[PDB]
Design a protein around this ligand. Sequence first.
Ligand SMILES: [Sm+3]
Ligand SMILES: [Sm+3]
Ligand SMILES: [Sm+3]
Length: 152
Amino acid sequence: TDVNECLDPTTCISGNCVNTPGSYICDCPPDFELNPTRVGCVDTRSGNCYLDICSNEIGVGVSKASCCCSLGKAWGTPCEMCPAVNTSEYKILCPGGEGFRPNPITVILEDIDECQELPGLCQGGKCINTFGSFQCRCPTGYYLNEDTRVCD
Ligand SMILES: [Sm+3]
Ligand SMILES: [Sm+3]
Ligand SMILES: [Sm+3]
């Protein structure tokens, strides 16, 4: 008889498993698509990332997870609000919690590089990417405005 692999927790990352004879299928939620190896779901669309809500663009042409699993509050056009951190939506979009996103091809979790993807988080300063976060240093004479993310 068949193994019901859906009882395995590593099965169908960010997706809904449906057991079949042989292995199983992963049903991806709306806006998500199955990766090449069929072990999980990822949102592969591109869109702008916004700090407020759609305004205050901090990233251009980035994925929704890179935006929303970081400091973004809204993403894309038409504007989609990032899911709140305690919802099932956030669990699906950010399976590794804050600061990380699944590789669009291997679905392996990787650190989001905020300096490469969301430069607007440090307007006018020097950004250093870190594991799970990033650092922003404003040049001498300027200070980080926490609400706008602009050195001054
Ligand atoms: Sm099976
Ligand atoms: Sm829902
Ligand atoms: Sm990072």
